[PDB]
Amino acid sequence: GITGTWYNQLGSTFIVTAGADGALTGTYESAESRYVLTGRYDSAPATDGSGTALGWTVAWKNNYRNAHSATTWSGQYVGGAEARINTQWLLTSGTTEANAWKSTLVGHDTFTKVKP
Amino acid sequence: GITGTWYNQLGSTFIVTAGADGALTGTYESAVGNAESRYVLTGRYDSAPATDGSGTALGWTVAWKNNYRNAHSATTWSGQYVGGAEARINTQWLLTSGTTEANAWKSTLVGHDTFTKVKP
Amino acid sequence: AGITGTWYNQLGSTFIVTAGADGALTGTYESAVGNAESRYVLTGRYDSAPATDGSGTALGWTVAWKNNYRNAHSATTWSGQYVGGAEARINTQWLLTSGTTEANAWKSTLVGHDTFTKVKP
Amino acid sequence: AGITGTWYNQLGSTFIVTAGADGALTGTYESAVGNAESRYVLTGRYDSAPATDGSGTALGWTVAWKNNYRNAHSATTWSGQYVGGAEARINTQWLLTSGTTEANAWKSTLVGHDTFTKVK
Ligand SMILES: COC(=O)c1cccc(-c2cc3c(=O)[nH]ccc3o2)c1
Numbered sequence: 006g007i008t009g010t011w012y013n014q015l016g017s018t019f020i021v022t023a024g025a026d027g028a029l030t031g032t033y034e035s036a037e038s039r040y041v042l043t044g045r046y047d048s049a050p051a052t053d054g055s056g057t058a059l060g061w062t063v064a065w066k067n068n069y070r071n072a073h074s075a076t077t078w079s080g081q082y083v084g085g086a087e088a089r090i091n092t093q094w095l096l097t098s099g100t101t102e103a104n105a106w107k108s109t110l111v112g113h114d115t116f117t118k119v120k121p
Numbered sequence: 122g123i124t125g126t127w128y129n130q131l132g133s134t135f136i137v138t139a140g141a142d143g144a145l146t147g148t149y150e151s152a153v154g155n156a157e158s159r160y161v162l163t164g165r166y167d168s169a170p171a172t173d174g175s176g177t178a179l180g181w182t183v184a185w186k187n188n189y190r191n192a193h194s195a196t197t198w199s200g201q202y203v204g205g206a207e208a209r210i211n212t213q214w215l216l217t218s219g220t221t222e223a224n225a226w227k228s229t230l231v232g233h234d235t236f237t238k239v240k241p
Numbered sequence: 242a243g244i245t246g247t248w249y250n251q252l253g254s255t256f257i258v259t260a261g262a263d264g265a266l267t268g269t270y271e272s273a274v275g276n277a278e279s280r281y282v283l284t285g286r287y288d289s290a291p292a293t294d295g296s297g298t299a300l301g302w303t304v305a306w307k308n309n310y311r312n313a314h315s316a317t318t319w320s321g322q323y324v325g326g327a328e329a330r331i332n333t334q335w336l337l338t339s340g341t342t343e344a345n346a347w348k349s350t351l352v353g354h355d356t357f358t359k360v361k362p
Numbered sequence: 363a364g365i366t367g368t369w370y371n372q373l374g375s376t377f378i379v380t381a382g383a384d385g386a387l388t389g390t391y392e393s394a395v396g397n398a399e400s401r402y403v404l405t406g407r408y409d410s411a412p413a414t415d416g417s418g419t420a421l422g423w424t425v426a427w428k429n430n431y432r433n434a435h436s437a438t439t440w441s442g443q444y445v446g447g448a449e450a451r452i453n454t455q456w457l458l459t460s461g462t463t464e465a466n467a468w469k470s471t472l473v474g475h476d477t478f479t480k481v482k
């Protein structure tokens with residue numbers, strides 16, 4: 006249920022293949038705009054109504070731009086008629102030590118299979 | 122650089138390779154939690170960082186399933202590598218467990234780990 | 242209109258708050274989840290002179306989960322901003338830390354996000 | 363309770379708090395220098411009847427970064443636990459939210475951690 010195209014609340018698109026070995030691979034488009042993503046998921050989740058745990062990372066460098074930063078999303082996939090990937094994220098920028106206190110933003114993204 | 126064997130402040134072991142393409146690959150052995158032996162990790166890093174003294178941004182994920190245990194959970198670490206005399210990777214992390222919807226509000230733990238190339 | 246009033250989050254918790262002229266937040270919180278029963282004291286702070294460029298109003302508050310009925314040995318802080326408009330909203334992220342031993346401190350803190358409206362969802 | 367008094371973080375910030383009998387935290391948060399322009403009101407809550415099994419004491423507090431001299435249009439909350447003893451600590455994680463437009467709300471909140479001690 007994870008493999009495919011997902012859309013967040015703010016116009017980003019998250020394209021992923023969930024491999025048999027637990028790998029997540031794909032591309033993330035935040036709007037020149039496409040970036041590699043890589044992560045992991047629980048390939049043997051419970052079958053009791055619980056979600057499937059997962060996470061992935063995008064480093065914001067491609068052949069066109071480099072923000073010197075990376076985001077990790079941590080969350081769970083929930084299947085069914087209104088399937089979702091519900092996540093919280095951390096976005097760390099490369100900084101000097103003096104600016105490291107303000108290096109990390111936090112937020113949350115909800116992904117759906119149908120454009121918002 | 123990033124490639125090497127690292128240890129967090131609690132004794133976990135982070136064996137990572139930073140590839141030419143921005144890929145992080147390797148294994149993680151946890152000193153806490155419902156964990157036993159090595160787990161696969163994968164992630165990404167900035168392969169062309171700034172040249173102004175700033176650190177190198179990175180992140181990686183471990184899903185806590187291997188051939189011996191499955192905790193139905195996954196941790197992501199987000200941080201930066203800082204070079205120098207004692208190289209360091211400073212991170213914050215999120216650990217999400219699979220839950221029912223009614224329990225989703227308590228699904229995610231947060232903390233911070235610092236990694237060096239020497240054991241604590 | 243403003244921060245003062247009765248608010249509800251997406252899970253049905255009830256947040257009754259007064260925003261004082263000095264920047265103070267006071268009131269009570271009743272949680273729809275967790276080891277909680279009835280109302281708990283909250284205190285916090287807000288920006289009493291927000292920017293005039295369309296930005297929201299920054300704020301935060303704390304509940305320690307002890308009252309006359311129960312004590313969960315934990316505390317939540319919500320950090321967020323009030324957004325005025327047709328449907329007023331307070332958007333927050335929160336940290337819930339439990340008292341633990343040192344060996345369990347790594348798993349002491351939960352994180353999440355709550356959105357509050359003056360209309361109960 | 364051991365909480366009342368002056369505490370110092372790892373980066374040169376100071377706070378002076380009073381822990382009231384029924385769970386109130388009140389005080390001031392400032393910089394190491396301590397000039398009036400760096401001082402802000404703080405308010406929060408703590409568990410006034412913690413466990414007796416060796417666990418820490420849960421607490422939290424908020425500073426809105428407005429005083430009579432400047433206004434950053436932002437607020438920080440610290441969530442953590444107090445641990446007593448000869449090397450007492452308050453170990454926290456924090457969230458700093460700025461007032462933003464909706465278009466910029468995705469980047470409104472910074473996260474980090476502070477460790478407070480009784481000595482600078
Ligand atoms: C439900 O399962 C878990 O909560 C669990 C299981 C196994 C290992 C971990 C673990 C290890 C580790 C670490 O070294 N640093 C930061 C977080 C973290 O989490 C967590």
Ligand SMILES: COC(=O)c1cccc(-c2cc3c(=O)[nH]ccc3o2)c1
Pocket residue numbers: 250254272273274275276277306313314315317335337339353355
């Ligand atoms: C194990 O959990 C607790 O110790 C506990 C006890 C009482 C209430 C809560 C509670 C309510 C609430 C909420 O509405 N939003 C965000 C966090 C949050 O936490 C947690």
